[PDB]
Structure formats: C-alpha cells, structure tokens
Scaffold this active site. Sequence first.
Site, mmCIF file in Angstrom:
data_model
loop_
_atom_site.group_PDB
_atom_site.id
_atom_site.type_symbol
_atom_site.label_atom_id
_atom_site.label_comp_id
_atom_site.label_asym_id
_atom_site.label_seq_id
_atom_site.Cartn_x
_atom_site.Cartn_y
_atom_site.Cartn_z
ATOM 1 N N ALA A 45 0.849 -1.193 0.000
ATOM 2 C CA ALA A 45 0.000 0.000 0.000
ATOM 3 C C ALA A 45 0.867 1.217 0.000
ATOM 4 O O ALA A 45 0.520 2.219 -0.580
ATOM 5 C CB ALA A 45 -0.886 0.014 1.203
ATOM 6 N N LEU A 55 10.386 21.389 8.129
ATOM 7 C CA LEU A 55 9.774 20.209 8.730
ATOM 8 C C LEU A 55 9.597 20.424 10.204
ATOM 9 O O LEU A 55 8.581 20.058 10.781
ATOM 10 C CB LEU A 55 10.639 18.971 8.469
ATOM 11 C CG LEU A 55 9.990 17.677 7.936
ATOM 12 C CD1 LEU A 55 9.839 16.709 9.067
ATOM 13 C CD2 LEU A 55 8.635 17.946 7.249
ATOM 14 N N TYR A 111 -6.343 0.614 -7.791
ATOM 15 C CA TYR A 111 -5.320 1.103 -6.862
ATOM 16 C C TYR A 111 -4.517 2.260 -7.404
ATOM 17 O O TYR A 111 -4.256 3.213 -6.683
ATOM 18 C CB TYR A 111 -4.326 0.012 -6.467
ATOM 19 C CG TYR A 111 -4.809 -1.018 -5.463
ATOM 20 C CD1 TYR A 111 -3.990 -2.087 -5.105
ATOM 21 C CD2 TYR A 111 -6.091 -0.965 -4.918
ATOM 22 C CE1 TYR A 111 -4.434 -3.082 -4.246
ATOM 23 C CE2 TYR A 111 -6.546 -1.961 -4.050
ATOM 24 C CZ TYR A 111 -5.713 -3.019 -3.723
ATOM 25 O OH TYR A 111 -6.164 -4.037 -2.903
ATOM 26 N N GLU A 130 9.014 23.098 11.632
ATOM 27 C CA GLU A 130 7.854 23.973 11.726
ATOM 28 C C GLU A 130 6.666 23.445 10.966
ATOM 29 O O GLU A 130 6.019 24.196 10.261
ATOM 30 C CB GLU A 130 8.227 25.372 11.214
ATOM 31 C CG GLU A 130 8.557 26.381 12.328
ATOM 32 C CD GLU A 130 9.790 26.027 13.158
ATOM 33 O OE1 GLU A 130 10.893 25.968 12.570
ATOM 34 O OE2 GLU A 130 9.653 25.821 14.389
HETATM 35 N N1 LIG Z 1 -3.516 3.859 -0.640
HETATM 36 C C1 LIG Z 1 -3.401 2.640 -1.094
HETATM 37 N N2 LIG Z 1 -3.854 1.642 -0.375
HETATM 38 C C2 LIG Z 1 -3.668 0.421 -0.964
HETATM 39 C C3 LIG Z 1 -3.079 0.132 -2.200
HETATM 40 N N3 LIG Z 1 -3.085 -1.211 -2.431
HETATM 41 C C4 LIG Z 1 -3.661 -1.710 -1.371
HETATM 42 N N4 LIG Z 1 -4.038 -0.765 -0.448
HETATM 43 C C5 LIG Z 1 -4.703 -0.952 0.847
HETATM 44 O O1 LIG Z 1 -3.677 -1.173 1.802
HETATM 45 C C6 LIG Z 1 -3.923 -2.407 2.482
HETATM 46 C C7 LIG Z 1 -3.176 -3.428 1.749
HETATM 47 O O2 LIG Z 1 -2.122 -3.900 2.463
HETATM 48 P P1 LIG Z 1 -1.253 -5.053 1.747
HETATM 49 O O3 LIG Z 1 -0.535 -4.633 0.558
HETATM 50 O O4 LIG Z 1 -2.237 -6.201 1.668
HETATM 51 O O5 LIG Z 1 -0.321 -5.210 2.884
HETATM 52 P P2 LIG Z 1 0.839 -4.403 3.380
HETATM 53 O O6 LIG Z 1 0.638 -4.130 4.857
HETATM 54 O O7 LIG Z 1 1.038 -3.275 2.468
HETATM 55 O O8 LIG Z 1 2.004 -5.581 3.270
HETATM 56 P P3 LIG Z 1 1.856 -7.266 3.390
HETATM 57 O O9 LIG Z 1 1.394 -7.632 4.802
HETATM 58 O O10 LIG Z 1 3.216 -7.939 3.197
HETATM 59 O O11 LIG Z 1 0.855 -7.764 2.320
HETATM 60 C C8 LIG Z 1 -5.384 -2.644 2.348
HETATM 61 O O12 LIG Z 1 -6.039 -1.902 3.347
HETATM 62 C C9 LIG Z 1 -5.659 -2.140 0.944
HETATM 63 O O13 LIG Z 1 -7.017 -1.761 0.808
HETATM 64 C C10 LIG Z 1 -2.602 1.207 -2.962
HETATM 65 O O14 LIG Z 1 -2.062 1.159 -4.061
HETATM 66 N N5 LIG Z 1 -2.799 2.456 -2.337
#
Ligand SMILES: Nc1nc2c(ncn2[C@@H]2O[C@H](COP(=O)(O)OP(=O)(O)OP(=O)(O)O)[C@@H](O)[C@H]2O)c(=O)[nH]1
Lengths: 410, 410, 423, 423
Positions: free
Chosen positions: C12, C235, C207, C237
Amino acid sequence: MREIVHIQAGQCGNQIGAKFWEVISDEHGIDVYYNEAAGNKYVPRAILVDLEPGTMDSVRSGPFGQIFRPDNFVFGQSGAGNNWAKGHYTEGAELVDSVLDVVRKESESCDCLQGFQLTHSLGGGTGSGMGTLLISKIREEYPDRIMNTFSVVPSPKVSDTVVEPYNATLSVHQLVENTDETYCIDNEALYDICFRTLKLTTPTYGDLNHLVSATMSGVTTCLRFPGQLNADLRKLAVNMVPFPRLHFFMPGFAPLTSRGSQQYRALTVPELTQQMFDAKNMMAACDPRHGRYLTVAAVFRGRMSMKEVDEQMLNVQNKNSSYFVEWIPNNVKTAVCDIPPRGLKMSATFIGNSTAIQELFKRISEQFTAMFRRKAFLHWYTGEGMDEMEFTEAESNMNDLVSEYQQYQD
Amino acid sequence: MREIVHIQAGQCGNQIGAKFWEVISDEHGIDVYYNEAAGNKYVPRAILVDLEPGTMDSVRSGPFGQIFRPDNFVFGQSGAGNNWAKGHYTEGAELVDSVLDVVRKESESCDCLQGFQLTHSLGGGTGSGMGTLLISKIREEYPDRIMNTFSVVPSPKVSDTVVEPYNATLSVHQLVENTDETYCIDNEALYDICFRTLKLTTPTYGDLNHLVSATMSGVTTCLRFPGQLNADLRKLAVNMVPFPRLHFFMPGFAPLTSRGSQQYRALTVPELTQQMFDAKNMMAACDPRHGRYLTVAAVFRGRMSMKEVDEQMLNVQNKNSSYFVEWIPNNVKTAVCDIPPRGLKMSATFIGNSTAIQELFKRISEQFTAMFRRKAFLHWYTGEGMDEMEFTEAESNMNDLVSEYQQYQD
Amino acid sequence: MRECISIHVGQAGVQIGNACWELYCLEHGIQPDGQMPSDKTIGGGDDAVFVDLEPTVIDEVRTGTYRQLFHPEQLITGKEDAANNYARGHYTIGKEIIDLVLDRIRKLADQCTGLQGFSVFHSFGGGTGSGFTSLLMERLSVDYGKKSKLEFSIYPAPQVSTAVVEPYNSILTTHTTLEHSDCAFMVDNEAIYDICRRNLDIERPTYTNLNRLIGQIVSSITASLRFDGALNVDLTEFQTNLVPYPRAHFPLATYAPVISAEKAYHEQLSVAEITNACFEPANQMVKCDPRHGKYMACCLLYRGDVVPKDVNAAIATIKTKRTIQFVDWCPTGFKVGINYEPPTVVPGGDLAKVQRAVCMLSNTTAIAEAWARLDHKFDLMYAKRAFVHWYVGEGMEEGEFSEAREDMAALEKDYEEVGVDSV
Amino acid sequence: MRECISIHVGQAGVQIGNACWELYCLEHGIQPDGQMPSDKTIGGGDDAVFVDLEPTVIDEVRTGTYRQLFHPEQLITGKEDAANNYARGHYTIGKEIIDLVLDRIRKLADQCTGLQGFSVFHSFGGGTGSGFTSLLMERLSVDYGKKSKLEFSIYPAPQVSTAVVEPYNSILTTHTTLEHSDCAFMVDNEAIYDICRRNLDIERPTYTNLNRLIGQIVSSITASLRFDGALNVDLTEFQTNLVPYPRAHFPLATYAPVISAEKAYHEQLSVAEITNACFEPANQMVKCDPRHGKYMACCLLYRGDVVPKDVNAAIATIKTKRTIQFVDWCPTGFKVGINYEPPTVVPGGDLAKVQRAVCMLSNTTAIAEAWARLDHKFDLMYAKRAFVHWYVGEGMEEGEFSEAREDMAALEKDYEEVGVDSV
Ligand SMILES: Nc1nc2c(ncn2[C@@H]2O[C@H](COP(=O)(O)OP(=O)(O)OP(=O)(O)O)[C@@H](O)[C@H]2O)c(=O)[nH]1
Ligand SMILES: Nc1nc2c(ncn2[C@@H]2O[C@H](COP(=O)(O)OP(=O)(O)OP(=O)(O)O)[C@@H](O)[C@H]2O)c(=O)[nH]1
Ligand SMILES: Nc1nc2c(ncn2[C@@H]2O[C@H](COP(=O)(O)OP(=O)(O)O)[C@@H](O)[C@H]2O)c(=O)[nH]1
Ligand SMILES: Nc1nc2c(ncn2[C@@H]2O[C@H](COP(=O)(O)OP(=O)(O)O)[C@@H](O)[C@H]2O)c(=O)[nH]1
C-alpha cells in the site's frame, strides 16, 4: 482295503461257514463290476480250522472243496469233543500255534487288514473253544483291528447235557475279549422257522442252515461291494455298538416265505419292511417287542424303488415308537445295494442291537446257576485244569448282561 | 513463491485428486499469461501415494498417466483395506518412510514452500489413515508451513459397516493436528446433487466426482493465478479461521444446472449469486440456513461485470442478515478472476466457515457413541494395537465440536 | 539543501510511493541523473528506501522494473511471501529484515551533512507494512530522536479489505506514536474509492487510480511545502502549526480542484471557487465530519501562482458563516501559504491540469469520530473472542491488545480534553 | 495377483471342492495350463491341496482320475480306510498325515510373494474331514496367524447320516474357532436334499446334485467376490462386513435364481423378481428362520451385469415390510455388490443359465436356532451315556466333551448378547 481275513473253525461251524462261500456267488472269474473283493486274492481268504477231521465233510466236498486246500487245519489226528477246557486249554492249544502261524502268513498280505470275522457256534469246544481261544489269541496281538464273529447259540432245545453248560463260559469273554462286534444266531429260532412259519416236517441241517448263510451273506459282501455308495467292516462297530460290553446283534433276513405261489404280499416292496422287523422272521427269536433297539441296520437287497424303502423304514421307526431307545438321535440307517441274491427279486437284512436278545442270554444263564451251580456236572472239565470257579466268574459275567442290558431295555 | 507441494493419497482419493489435474488445463506448454504456476516445475508437484496398487487406475491411465511417474508410491505389493490401525499404525508405517523421503526430496526445491494441500477421503485407512498419518508426519516437522486437506466425508448413506466408524477417529486430530485449514466434501451431498437437483438416474463415480474436481480447481489455481489482483495459500487461513480448533470449510460451486437449454436464469450474473449460496448446490449438504457463517470466501469465475458481483455479494450479506455471525466486521470478501473454466461462461465457488457443517460432524458422531460404544465392532482394530479407547478419546473430541461449534451457531 | 529521508514499507505504501516519485515529476529530478547525484541539492540529490516484505509488489521497479528505476539497492526485499499477523511481520519475520533496512537507512540518512527528517509512507491494517514499520520507527526513534517524522498512513476502507485488518491499527497505533511520529496524515481509502468515483467518475477505482490521487495530495503537502521557492516552511515547523499536543494529533487533509478531462473544468475556478469545495466534505481525505468539532489549527495551502489579496476573499466569506468555529486556546485563524509553482498533472494519470491548486490542513476534533469507529470493529470481536490466536501462534501477545487499546482509546479521550469545555 | 489358498479335507469336502473347480470353469483357467503356471495371476496360478483320509473318494482325480487332474501331487492321501471317531482322525491317525499336508501347504502357501488367505472347504460330522481339519487349522493358525481363514463346513443332514455324528460338531467347533477361522459358511445338507428336490425337482438328490449346488453358491461368494473386475472386495474385508464379533459368527447364505431346464425360467426374473425369493426361506443354506432375529449385517451379491438404479427397487419394496428388522449397533442397511460377469452354469450339472445371479449374506441371530438343535441331539445321549467310549478307546478324552460344550454353548449365549436387549 477292507482286507477281511475270514476265519472258519469247528466241525459244526465249517459246515455253515462253508456253504456261505457257496452263497458268495461270483466264482473264480466268469461274471457291481466295480467289485470290492474284500478279504484276499481270488481264493477265499478263509482259513478253515477244525480240531477233529471235519474240515472235509462237505467242506472239501461237492460245494467248493477247494478252500485254499493247502493250508487247511487239522494238525493230523486229534480229538476235542464237547469239553471247553479241551480246545482252549488242551487238545487245541496244540493247534492254536498252527493256526496263529497260518492266519498271520495270511493276514499280513500287504493291503490294510480289515480285521477277522471268525465263524463258529458257541458251546462245542471243538471250534467254539478253539475259536473263542483264537480270538483272545488274535486279540492282545492285533488290538487295533476290529474282530467279528457269527457265533451260533445252542437252541434252548438242548442237545448234550453239555451243548449248553458250554457257551455260558464263552459269553464270559466273547464280549470282554476281541469281539468289538459279533452277530448271533439261535438254533432255536432256526427250527421254529422251518416249523412255526416256513414249512418242513423236519429241518435237515440242509434246512436249519440255509438261512444261516443267506443271512450272513446278506450282511457280509453287501455293505461291501458297490451298490448304493459304500460301507466297510468297522464304521459299523461305532454306529452299532453304543457300549463297551457292547451288545450282540440280532440278525434277521426277511423274504423267507415258503414255496407256494408266494403272494403273501408277493414280496411287496413295503413287505420287506415288515417281512423282516419281526420275530416270526428273526434269527435269534427273542420277542424284539420287548426292549427298544439301541440301534438297527437295514440292508435292502434287489434293485427296487429306494423311495419306498425310506418311506417304509422310517415308517416303523415312526411306528413302534415304543421300541427305539430314544436317546440316540436317529437310531437307524437304511442301505440299498443293487445286485440281488438268487431267488427273491427283493430281500432285506435286519441287524439290530435290540435289548430283546437279552432273553437269548439269560437262557444260557439260568442253566449254569441252575445246574453247573445248582450242583454239578462240571466234574468233566476239571480234568483239564479248570478247577473250581472259572464257571462262576464266568457265571459272574454273562449273567451280568441281564442287569446291564435291562438298564436301557426299559 | 506459493510453492505448493500437492499431496494425493489413497485409492479412492487419487481417483478424484487425479482428474483434478485433468481440470487444471494449461497442459505442458501450448497456451493470465502472467502465470502463477504454484507448486513445482512443469510436472505436477503432485506426490501420489497409495497403500495398495491404486496409483494406476485411471491415475496412470487415459487422463494424464504421467504424474512424475518415476516417483509414485506403492512400495510394491501390500494391503491395508478398511482398517484405520492399518496404514497409520501398520501396513503403511512401512510406506510413510517412503513418502516422507520423496516429498522432502520434492518439498525443498528452492522456492519458498507454500505448505501441503493433502487430498484424500476420511474413513478408509488406505489413504485416509496413511494420509491422516502423513499430516501428523509432515507436521511436527514443518510447523511453520500451512497444511491443507480436501478430505471427503463418507456419505451418511453408509458403505461398509466400517466406511463410517472410520473417519470419526480422524476428525479426532484432523483438526488438532496439521490442518490449519481444510475444505470438506460429503458424498451424501454429491449423490443428492446428481439426484435431488442435477439429473442422473444414477451417479457413476464418473458423476459423483465431477463436481469434486471442478470445485477444488475453483478454489485451487484461482486465488492463485493473475485474475483480479492476487492471493496465496495462507492469508486465507487467517481470514477464514477465527479459531484454533478452526472450522471445516463448506465448499460449493454453483453453475451445476443440468443439460437442457439451461435458461434457469441462463447463468444470469446475479444467478451465480444464488445458484451458489444454497444447500441445493453445496458440497456438504447441511442446511447452511442453520447457523451463521463465521466467514465466507467467494470466487467468481468467467470474466463479467465486477459491479453486479459486489452489488450482489453484499446483497445477501445484506439479505439473510440472520446468517452472518455479526461480531466479525465484514465476514465476507469477493474475488473475481478473469479466465473461466471449460463450459460455463460464468461460475462461482463457495468457501464458507458456516456453523452448519456442524451436522456433517455430529453425524460421524452419533454412530460411534451409537455403535463403536453402543457396544462394539472395534474388535477389528485392536488386532493392530489400538487397545481400548483411542476410539473414545477420539469420541471425546470430534464429538466436542458439537458444543464448540454450537457456541456461535446460535 | 537539507533533505528529509523517506521510506515506504508495504505494498500500500510501495504502490503509493511508487506513484509519487511519478508525480514528483515536477521539474528537475529526471534526465541523466541516473546515478548522477551531482548538481542542485533537492528533490532527492538522487531522487529513498523501498522496503516491502513481499518481494514482488516491490519488484515492479527493478526485476521486471516498471517504466523506471531510481537506484537498484535502495529497495530492500525478502522472500517470506507476506505475513499479515502484525506480530507476523513486526516481530518474527520483521526482526529479520530490519537491520538491512535500518543499516541502509542510516547509510543514507547519514550522507551529506545536516539530516533533519523522515517521511514514512505507511499504510496500516496488514502486517509487513502494518507491523514491520511499527518496528522500523521504534528503531529510528532510537537513532534519530532529535529528528522529526511524518507518515502518510493509508487508513483501511469500509469496503472492508480483510478481517483481522480492523484490529491491526490498534495493536499498531499503541506504540507507533509517542515512540515516534510528530505528525501523520490519515488517508482512509474509503474516501477515494468514493471521490475518485464521483468528482472523477471512474467506475471501479483501481489502486493506481487511487494512487494517482493520494499521490497528488502528498505533493500538495510535502513537496507543496518542501522546496524553498517563495513563501516557505521547515519540517521542524510543520507541527508548530498543525500539531496541538505531543499526542501526535492526526491532521486532516483536503484537496479541492479535482477535474477529470471528460468533464468541464469550467475554464477555471475563481481562486475562491475552489477554496470552499476545499471546504466541502467529499473533498477531504479521512471520511470525517468536522461538523462537530473545534479546529485546533486549520491552514490553507494554495498552489500555482496566487496573489493573497484575493485569497482572504473567501477566508472571509467563509468566516461570515456561523458554522466552522474553533476552540479557545488558539487564535481562530489560519496560516495560509501560497505557491506560484503550477499544479503538476500526469498523462491521463492525474487527469487535467489545474490553474490553481488548493489543499489545506486542519486537525478538527471530529476526525476522532471516523477514527474510533475503527475501534468498534475491534472492541467488537477482539473483546469477545476474535482471531486473537494468530497474533500468538506466530508471535507473542495475549494483551498485545487491550494493553494497547487504552492509549488508543485515551485518544478519543484526549480529543475531548480539547472539546468538551472552555479550557 | 494375491492368491488365497484352499484345502478340502474329507470326502464331503473333496467331493464338493471336486465339483467346484468344475464350476470354476468360469473363464481362463482351463486350456493348456496343465503344468503351465505362467500368464495371468488368478483363478489359481495353476488352478490347491486335496487331503482326504480315505485314499479313494479323493482318488477319482489321479488314479483312475475322474474326467480331469490339476496337479498330481497336491492331493495328499493315506491308507487308513477312514476313521470316524474325531479323535480317530484328529489325534491318532491325523497326527500322521498332518505334516505332509502342513508341509505341502506351506510349500504352496509360500509361493509367489504376498499370501493372505486360506479357504478350507470342510464338512463336519465324521472324523477325517471332521477331526483332521480340527488339527489342520490348529496348525495353520500356528504358522499363518496374520492370515485370515474361510471355511465352507457342510452341516449334517436331519435325514441324519450317522449317529456319533451329531456329537462331532461339538467336540469340533470347541476349538475349530477362536483358534482359527474368522468366517465360516454353514451349509446343512438338509437344506438341498430339500431345495434340490423342490426348486430343482429331482427325486433322490445325489451327492453330485447336492455338490453341483453347494458348488454354485461357493462361486457366488469366493469367486463372486475374488477376481477384481469392477465393484470388488478383499478377504481381509470379508468379515469387516459379515463378521460382528471375534465370536466367529457364521454368516447365513442364500441363492435366488434357481431353475432346472425342464421347467419355465420365465424368460427371466426382474432383477427384483429374484431378490425376494432371495429372501424366501426355502432358498437359503442353513435351514434356519431369521424370522426371530435381528440381523447384525446383511449384504446382497447380484451377479451378471446389473445397474444399481434397479436394485434398490426391491431393497426398497422389502424395507416397506415391517418385518426383517435389525439390531441397533449397526446401520440397518446393506452392502450390495454387483457383478457384470454372467452366472456360469454347467452341462446338465448346474441346470439352466440365469440372466441374473443373486446371492446375499446376512448373519441373523436366528441361525443360532438350527444351530443349537444340533446341541440337543447331543446333550441328549452324550450326557446320559452315549457312544463316548470310542472317542476314548481310540484316543484321549472324558471331557473331550463337556469341556468342549460350554463355549459351543456360550454361542447361543453370545447370540443373545446381541438380541435380547437394546445394547
Ligand atoms: N492507498 C493505497 N492503499 C492500498 C493500495 N493497495 C492496497 N491498499 C490498501 O492497503 C492495504 C493493503 O495492504 P497489503 O498490501 O495487503 O499489505 P501491506 O501491509 O502493504 O504488506 P503485506 O502484509 O506484506 O501484504 C489494504 O487496506 C488495501 O485496501 C494502494 O495502491 N494504495
Ligand atoms: N454337502 C455335501 N455333503 C456331503 C456330500 N457327501 C457327503 N456329505 C456329508 O458328509 C457326511 C457323509 O459322510 P460319509 O460319506 O458317510 O463319510 P466320509 O466323509 O467319507 O468319512 P471320513 O473319511 O471319516 O470323514 C454327511 O454329513 C453328509 O451329509 C456331498 O457331496 N455334499
Ligand atoms: N444253525 C446251525 N447250528 C448248528 C449247525 N451245526 C451245529 N450247530 C449247533 O452246534 C451245536 C452242536 O454242534 P457244534 O457245537 O457246532 O459242534 P463242534 O463244531 O464239534 O464244536 C448245537 O448247539 C447246534 O445248534 C449248523 O449247521 N447250523
Ligand atoms: N468423493 C469420492 N468419494 C469416493 C470415490 N470413490 C470412493 N469414494 C468414497 O470414499 C469413501 C472413503 O473411503 P475410500 O475413499 O474408499 O477409501 P480409500 O480406498 O482408502 O481411498 C468411501 O466411503 C467411498 O464411498 C470417488 O471417486 N469420489
């Protein structure tokens, strides 16, 4: 395999045992054809044995005077009249060795030895003292082997002040000595047939002897050769001898009839099943209707409806339910065996262990304690040992059976 | 990375697990194209294992009788019929060593090892006693790794006075031993489909087995290869297993229909979202409408309007609000994955932890205490150790779930 | 000159981050710079730590790449397919790749004199990047205490992605605060899968769609205020204004001129036609409702050349509305910053270039709301049984929760110790 | 492949067995195989131990032969005309030819890997094959314990063949059980001398007539379930279904489509026109009456191609009848097995070929009846005097009985510990 070593001893015994082999008709070749020639090779395994020179009479006469001839026993000159001690303690203990030398050089003969069916007539020391000896002499030597005997009981008629106190010293062991099984005839019954039923203003031994042979054969060779399935000479002593001190078989042909247009049921198939089961036609004459039979063997002869026979044989088994011990689950078995005799077209053969022969025992029993004990006449045996008893320990035996037998007769 | 070490043991287990690789259609070359070939190199990572010689049937037959052939297990000559003790205490403890020698010289294979999805059918000791052993044998060795099992429960129909008291000694650990996660079919439900819904005047194993494979694949390879986003074989066991003594998944395809101009909603996009969520189309047959599901996974197949699917999948999630525990914030998640099967144009795949499977448990439970305890028939196992209990401490387990499960079923 | 370091742990975050240096295409920091650190000192003197726990999502950069590559070396990676048991990635696995990441960082965070800074792009609710960063920081804070930390942690989406997901936040916040981070910008995916579906049409907000939008906002913050130019910021501030009490308060974000390309931008929006939508609910990040809460700050950020004399024109109009309302202990005003630099948009990715960019930052005591409801889908299960045994059979705990539910509870507690009374 | 060995001791057995490998003319196991063991592995890789005690009945094979000969060597034989005093053939004589038979067997039962099995064709009530097998097994069980044992012991016939006969069974069973045999199919000649006289006409049912019929049934068991094909079975898995407790329970047999040739077969009998006569008393083996007894099993065996969908059609109809009734501790059902292989009949010997063969197997707690009456024609004499002295003057005993009357009594004892109550 049922290699039977047929024994035939005593004058007035060979005479019967002989014309028996006259009844065993299949000669020396020229004749089911899937023969069961039990005994020996094509010369009667018979081993005739006489104290005197009676091994010749009609023995080596008109009938078949060729009973392996070069073996016959006589010893050569001797005696032994009507003295038990004689021919069982004396003028015979000479012969024994002779016999117990030729039966063995005869018994053996490869094939498994059946046993020895010894012929003779109780109460005549010649061959009913020699033979009763042979037994205790064939026994305690051939334990395993089953012994048989077609002893003939001296008709209550009473020949000899001795043709009586005789045998009573025999059924003193002729039932505790080799004799696991022994059929028994009663001359009494024999006159009576050639009189009380069959005709004959008099029974020539050529009469009061016929049945004697057409009755043995009717139990011998059958339950032997082919016929329906098979049989040997020993599974018998196990289905017909409920006890040690066994019981004497009460043989009994049937189609005796008489001359005339024999239409008395004209040998009806069910007739055989009546013409037999009665004292009017039994070879021991002892009101079978007395005690039940611990067992009974039948032997229908002359090819005919095996249905009727089991339909009839059970019939009476379902009939006089008052005469079949009833603690021996299925105290009867039939036997049907093709090839018939020489004049019946049908014929049966009783062989029952009926507690009625009791009579034919307490007879030769109320003559000893009632004579040879009532006082004497025994001072004719002591000559040859036999001092004192041996006539009382002998009386304390055959007399027993009264009780013994009477215990199931009920 | 999801290196899956596919296990397939037992005669009447290989047969299904086989034609599964028939369902996994992508052959050996000649084909998203951004493939997720989980397991092993281009030869089924499969490690077939039989006690008898069943590793051949249609195994090494018409389908794809080339499952890495030079590795297959048999040992060479043996037995183990319907005796749990057998193939888990005896005629198999022979084989184990053999297997736990070839799976390892297979498991390893560089790439991180997913776990082991072991196939087989509870209650048949061959490979449901060998396999239930393999587990406890792959376990306490590969703790870390997640294990899977597509166990088949013996239809309440009752084959063998033993195809029953069997497995009840399995769910005695096939839920306390490696099995962090395990789907589960009920042959009962299988007949019933080829009867109570789908056609078939009789279900040839070439029937009561089809779904068995077009259902596994429908959960296997998907949630595996490309499709929408991704998935592996373990984040599952963490979103689908609320508890240790976990819960057995109640799989359930949908587009089963039947022949005919299948116009029953003619696979309407919202149909999949109904043609599935019902016992008339569940592979365990247990009135889901009993207790709520602690969780549920869906897997829509055959490229189509992802809108409708979340519009429909929540729908029922917003529908039978009476069957979704409701203490597990969002007890559902959909999955859409492109490339479809070989005849549906659209297809789903149920995978829910519904407290309804409770039935398909208290079944193989009111037969033991109601037999193997009601008296006996166990005197067929003791032969191979197993004295006394081990059937009661086993009854004091799988019988538990009743209570356990009944605690959220509510 | 003085560069702050950034580290995006977790898909994410990686995916986000990945689409930011794509947005950070705003000027000089592209051409023949590959391994050319030389020249000017900013945008990244080598425009950097990518540490994921799933060697793949974080592989669409080097092996297979993905349209580009900064510096094959600054993207730590493992093998352990994932995790997803906080402990499972915060302890167990984490503990493994946390010294190649903490070594790398230090061996980056310690290049060219004068540090000061750490922008940790996060995302909570899924171990790896939910549990491994819970540690990253516990580490950094141990070796950069005098340095500040920002974190754009992506909040979970009511479209609820994963169970056991709700509960991560809690066993996460509990220490991913005091023990680090002075500021942190909650995103809440729910928001976008809603806005990038309304104000930007789009049916099934992919995504990247959601990244090309959480990525813009980030510029209109960090970047928006991190390259001198004219009116500026430091930063240090960043909290002094945005951060009431050490209780790390989470400032709420809100971007206003969002127009696709297929719809009419209206030629333009008065420099005030914007700074009202900028005050429209649906144009925020955290799906909150400051309709019930006394701002403890609030400070606009206009971008792309604007003359102040026109700004207050709305800062006014608004003021004229009885609503809004602040607290007390704070001069119920603003801190408005204007950027002449034009708003950078990308090819179909950002959708339409604006004339005037506007994105403010206020910490209303109302975020507490959409911020404790995430405590409900927790006090719910995780108090009555729940998937608690995985955060055990894969690491320690049994109060890894609870113990870490009070301070994360004392939050909506604090959020009233600045809202219920006249103090 | 894995062949079970068979040994028929005793005329009743020799004759039976003799007419079975005659029935076992069902396919490949005839032509130029004389001493040609090679090829396929079944029907007998050399289609075998014939040990009688009467060198003759067992001589209508080699010396004189009898239309055929398997392998002059596997038919042990003695000289001892017979015996018929159990002890007389179990001890005395037996003790002689028991090491040429046990040697031969082992040197047969130990050919081609993987044994498993012993089908002892019996017949009790007459030493030799009534007393010598009481020993055979006492031997085998000593050197094949891990192997199972079947035995089609021919039960005596109320047409009562021999006295001292009743009593063999008893001094026989007493140890010809636990100390061997897991299963044993009681025949009871009575049966056939009745059925092969009714359903097959015939006036005076000759042994062969009775052998050409106990012989068929045996196929529709052993054979019926001993050559893979389709739906199958394993000897190990013969008791698991048919054998309640170690108390060797004697399963009751019942063949259904029996038609001579001189009468109308009716073109055919519905695959259900049969499976009811198959439930008609007069079509059974042991002349029992399961009319008073809770089956502990029951499993049909249809033969000669049949489709299941039609079978249950009667398994149903029947069910609809309040009668039958099972016990408790057993899923009151079936185990129905179907064979496509057609029912093999012989030239006048089997009389007419059927379209559908049907022969089930149930162990009703009612066989105990026709099975203890055989204890009456014993508690009768053999308690009040009886021919007991032969089983002595030809061997040991004097409690060879009694001692061996309790367990053979405890039988109708056990047979109620599964019928008088709800346990
Ligand atoms: N902002 C954002 N959120 C994302 C994206 N892809 C997934 N998410 C959200 O972020 C979370 C996904 O986490 P994961 O990628 O499954 O896990 P992680 O904590 O990033 O890492 P792992 O545990 O190793 O899978 C979920 O809440 C998704 O809805 C993205 O591209 N952008
Ligand atoms: N089923 C059946 N039973 C038979 C057959 N032949 C005989 N019997 C039975 O076996 C017994 C008859 O045995 P016999 O013929 O008198 O004697 P045996 O078996 O040769 O005697 P031994 O060698 O001592 O075992 C009775 O129980 C008959 O019912 C046959 O062909 N089939
Ligand atoms: N039935 C029958 N009895 C006979 C015959 N010859 C003699 N007896 C009987 O035998 C007894 C007299 O002769 P027996 O004792 O044989 O004389 P031994 O041979 O010299 O001892 C009498 O009891 C007769 O009944 C015969 O041919 N037939
Ligand atoms: N699902 C399914 N079950 C089967 C199949 N063949 C047999 N079974 C059942 O599997 C159950 C469990 O035992 P079984 O599989 O025979 O055990 P195995 O012989 O050790 O593999 C039995 O009750 C069979 O009815 C098949 O193809 N599919």
